[PDB]
């Protein structure tokens, strides 16, 4: 006979002891552990709600991978790369570039907990978390690797985090801030709770729905399998938050959640927004980006946050307005500066798409539509110089993304600036400035790409000098319109 897990599980996490040959603080230094002075004994009440044990883990994960790899192998000749809409291929390229090595970085957030959390159940669940992110890093290198021989832009699945390309900087600035650059309890709260019960469902399930509509089952099956792991190891954060609240640290907990959700939001708006509302072919759009937001972040995530005893973040109304607006502007920036991206943005503004955009975002044509009217007219009249830029966008000192506003008939744009320690910083929202002010030692001497351009570090100081600095190694790697402007014909 075997004994049931309930009967012996407690011994697996009976691993706290009272240090004697070093102090408790030496063994769990606050800068790595982030226990906020809460003593070891209080952490023993931590109770991970989604348990696993080592023999079940290896067995089940064996089965998860068996299915992921089988499906990849069975569909290799489906001609996705050749038969898909090129906006779909670009979605793959940005996804793998923006995520694969970021998953592997997440091993280090989970390792931070496995070593430095004072909660014993956290240290074990983090050990499975380490293993999970290892899986996710290896899957999302292995899957795009077969496309290297087709297209050098797929080399950025591996290369992007090794570059200074603007979006890779945005991604690394975010992940280094919430995953690899803070103490264990901050990782529990900012990564596993805020990012991984909030936003990753958008990229890895919302996008899966579009992939399934697009007939790309290899990818949909991959990323929904990945998210099954997340659903387990993300449950490390709730129990940490509950403990912090029970021990007088509600305010600190709340500030960390508020900060992580805003930071995650700006990056997902520039990567997932354009994908969902523009790159994904019209007839594959399961829902709009905003509809998916209201399902996953407002309806599911925010309701969980309230259930755990936290508050709606102070910026909630700003956030809701931002969902209606920001990614349309971010799409435009990525598309106009497409040559600095390692994928091929689709403009997504054929008349049919513009009718859809107007339905999903009433007032769109009198705003962003005004910009796309000019661009589209230049394309029809083969004025292609007016469709490539000759300067840099100004960039946020927090999110690393261009500073944008609402264009057209009711034009509004606002930069939120700050002097600090003899330097002038610029932010794309009230919230991004606030995040900086919450922890200036984390950010103050960081230089965004435009800061670097003006400081002499990018040579020559030219758009070409900047493309070289960003890591592009051949003409084929820089982004182009996904359809070579064929969409203009539909106009």
């Amino acid at each position: 006979a075997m004994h049931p897990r309930k009967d012996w599980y407690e011994l697996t996490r009976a691993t706290n002891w009272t240090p004697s040959y070093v102090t408790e603080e030496q063994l769990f230094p606050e800068r790595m552990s982030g226990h906020m002075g809460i003593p070891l004994e209080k952490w023993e009440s931590y109770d991970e709600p989604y348990k696993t044990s080592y023999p079940e883990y290896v067995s089940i994960q064996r089965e998860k991978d068996a299915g992921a790899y089988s499906v990849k192998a069975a569909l290799e000749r489906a001609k996705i790369y050749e038969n898909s809409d090129p906006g779909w291929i670009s979605t793959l390229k940005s996804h793998y570039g923006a995520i694969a090595v970021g998953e592997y970085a997440a091993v280090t957030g989970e390792g931070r907990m496995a070593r430095f959390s004072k909660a014993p159940g956290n240290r074990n669940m983090a050990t499975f978390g380490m293993m999970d992110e290892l899986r996710h890093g290896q899957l999302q290198l292995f899957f795009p690797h077969e496309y290297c021989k087709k297209d050098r832009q797929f080399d950025w699945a591996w290369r992007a985090y090794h570059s200074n390309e603007w979006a890779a900087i945005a991604a690394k600035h975010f992940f280094d801030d919430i995953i690899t650059g803070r103490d264990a309890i901050s990782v529990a709260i900012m990564l596993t709770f805020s990012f991984e019960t909030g936003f990753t469902n958008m990229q890895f399930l919302g996008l899966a729905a579009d992939a399934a509509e697009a007939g790309d089952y290899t990818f949909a099956n991959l990323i929904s399998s990945i998210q099954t792991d997340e659903s387990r190891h993300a449950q490390q954060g709730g129990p940490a938050l509950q403990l912090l609240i029970e021990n007088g640290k509600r305010e600190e907990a709340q500030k960390k959640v508020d900060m992580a959700i805003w930071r995650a939001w700006r990056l997902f708006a520039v990567l997932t927004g354009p994908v969902m509302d523009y790159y994904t072919p019209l007839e594959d759009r399961s829902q709009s980006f905003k509809e998916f937001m209201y399902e996953w972040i407002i309806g599911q995530f925010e309701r969980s946050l309230i259930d755990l005893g936290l508050d709606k973040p102070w910026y909630w109304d700003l956030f809701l307005k931002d969902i209606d607006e920001l990614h349309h502007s971010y799409h435009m920036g990525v598309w106009y500066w497409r040559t600095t991206a390692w994928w091929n943005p689709a403009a997504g503004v054929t008349p049919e798409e513009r009718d859809w955009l107007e339905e999903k975002y009433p007032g769109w044509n009198k705003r962003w539509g005004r910009c796309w009217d000019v661009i589209t007219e230049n394309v029809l009249n083969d004025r292609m110089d007016l469709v490539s830029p000759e300067t840099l966008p100004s960039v946020c000192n927090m999110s690393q993304i261009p500073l944008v506003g609402v264009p057209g008939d009711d034009w509004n744009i606002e930069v939120f600036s700050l002097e600090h320690n003899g330097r002038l910083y610029h932010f794309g929202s009230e919230v991004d400035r606030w995040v900086f002010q919450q922890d200036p030692v984390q950010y103050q001497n960081h230089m965004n790409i435009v800061d670097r351009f003006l400081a002499g570090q990018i040579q020559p100081m030219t758009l070409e000098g900047a493309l070289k600095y960003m890591g592009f190694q051949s003409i084929e790697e820089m982004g182009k319109d996904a359809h070579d402007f064929a969409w203009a014909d539909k106009c």
Partner: protein, 82 residues
């Protein structure tokens, strides 16, 4: 006396780095910003373009130079129509 500013052009969707000159009139600055905007993402129109500090209510006079203006490098300006 290259002088970087960050400039938001009326009806455009972003703020851009534009490098103006220290001795430049506000008329010349408004041209240099328009270069990167009008007929790219913003439709041309009749009227006089004017320059203000970002979100300001005061316009800089047309003849004033960035030097006479007291702007610091990398400050944000708006380019707007009268």
């Amino acid at each position: 006396s290259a002088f970087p500013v960050h400039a938001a052009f009326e009806k455009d969707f972003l703020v851009q780095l534009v490098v103006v000159d220290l001795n430049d009139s506000m008329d010349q600055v408004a041209e240099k910003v328009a270069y990167h905007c009008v007929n790219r993402r913003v439709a041309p129109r009749e009227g006089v373009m004017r320059v203000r500090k970002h979100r300001s209510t005061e316009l800089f006079p047309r003849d004033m130079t960035i030097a006479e203006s007291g702007l610091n490098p990398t400050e944000v300006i708006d380019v707007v129509f009268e």
